[PDB]
């Protein structure tokens, strides 16, 4: 149901920009690890938890974009004339991120080395998160309440987006500099968060409904946490701790 063709185009372009500025930043690490045939420096816990995050998000986006049964539940819950708040680029990002996270896991087994296996409090996290998901799956099964369950997978992606930015900012604080500050990478993350927020807004301007912001509250909090923490990193680096 697009009303405006220019808006639908704009929604598609900023949507593909969000996929570009976010999915592109997976490659520098992969290139580095091949060149060096080693992953002594990578945070193994982070890659593991970023697979969990990217899988929860992937389940939500792929299921809502390709299941008519789940879409029917989306129209029952949020409204008859509602546009599905998942775009082709949301599905593309999720599938490409899971693929790039599994390739980095391949690089960690095949190159590995050093004294890194990390897998304590982190592994623990994976257990509790996939266990929680599993409890929720058996709750959604006796009524086939599939849209409620993929709304949990998206809440899990929100949790893990916090697990991404918090410990990082926390390191920069408990320490001092912004050590590892990548202007390029930080600019592109910011870009993906603005583009993904702008996409949702363009969808709201066209249909004239803010319900997409609750129908996909995972994507609304993903973009906002990303932008918030990027501004913080900027504000660490450009002010609070120069060097």
């Amino acid at each position, epitope marked *: 149901s697009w009303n405006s063709i220019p808006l639908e185009i704009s929604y598609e372009i900023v949507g593909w920009i969000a996929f570009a500025s976010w999915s592109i930043s997976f490659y*520098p*690490q992969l290139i580095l690890n091949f060149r060096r*045939r080693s992953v002594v*420096g990578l*945070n193994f816990d982070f890659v593991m938890l970023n697979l969990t995050k990217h899988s929860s998000y992937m389940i939500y986006n792929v299921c809502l974009y390709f299941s008519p049964v789940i879409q029917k539940q989306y129209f029952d819950t949020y409204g008859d004339k509602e546009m599905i708040p998942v775009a082709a680029n949301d599905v593309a990002f999720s599938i490409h991120a899971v693929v790039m996270t599994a390739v980095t896991l391949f690089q960690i087994f095949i190159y590995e080395r*050093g004294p890194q296996k990390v897998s304590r409090l982190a592994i623990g996290i994976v257990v509790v998160v996939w266990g929680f998901a599993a409890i929720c799956f058996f709750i959604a099964l006796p009524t086939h309440s599939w849209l409620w369950l993929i709304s949990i997978f998206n809440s899990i992606q929100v949790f893990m987006t916090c697990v991404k930015y918090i410990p*990082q900012a926390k390191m920069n604080f408990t320490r001092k500099s912004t*050590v590892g500050w990548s202007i390029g990478n930080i600019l592109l993350d910011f870009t993906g968060g603005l583009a993904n927020y702008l996409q949702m807004v363009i969808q709201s301007i066209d249909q004239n409904s803010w319900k997409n912001f609750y129908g996909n509250m995972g994507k609304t909090l993903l973009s906002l946490i990303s932008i918030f923490f990027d501004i913080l990193f900027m504000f660490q680096h450009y002010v609070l701790y120069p060097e």
Partner: nanobody, 121 residues
Framework: QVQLVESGGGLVQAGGSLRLSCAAS????????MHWYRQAPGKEREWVAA????????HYADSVKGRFTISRDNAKNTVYLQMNSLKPEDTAVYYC??????????????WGQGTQVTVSA
């Protein structure tokens, strides 16, 4: 403001032992996971050994495992690579290393200058 100064390297005969040293400025060695790496002519940087931060735990490459022993003298802020049973193979510039490991972004490696260890058969 962090500095890593390698010394102890030079010529030794195959079978011989050397005790590489790494003087550290701007940071405590006991409060950090310290690494040793090596670069041979035409080869790529090889991870060699590492010691755990607040603990005696040590990990070694399969090429040096058993022969090389990485220790730390906190009372001199220096890391040591007691490289024993050496072979001409081990000919490489050994760098001591300390990383500023990141959560998400790239990890910052602080290298030293280097000390050639040339093993002569």
């Amino acid at each position: 403001q962090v500095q890593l100064v390698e010394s102890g390297g030079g010529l030794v005969q195959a079978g011989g032992s050397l005790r590489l040293s790494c003087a550290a400025s701007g940071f405590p060695v006991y409060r950090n996971r310290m690494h040793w790496y090596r670069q041979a002519p035409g080869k790529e940087r090889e991870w060699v050994a590492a010691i755990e931060s607040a603990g005696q735990e040590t990990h070694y490459a399969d090429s040096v495992k058993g022969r090389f022993t990485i220790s730390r003298d906190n009372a001199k802020n220096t890391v040591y690579l007691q490289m024993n049973s050496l072979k001409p193979e081990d000919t490489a510039v050994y760098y001591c290393n300390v990383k500023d490991e990141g959560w998400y972004w790239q990890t910052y490696d602080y290298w030293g200058q280097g000390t050639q260890v040339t093993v002569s058969a």
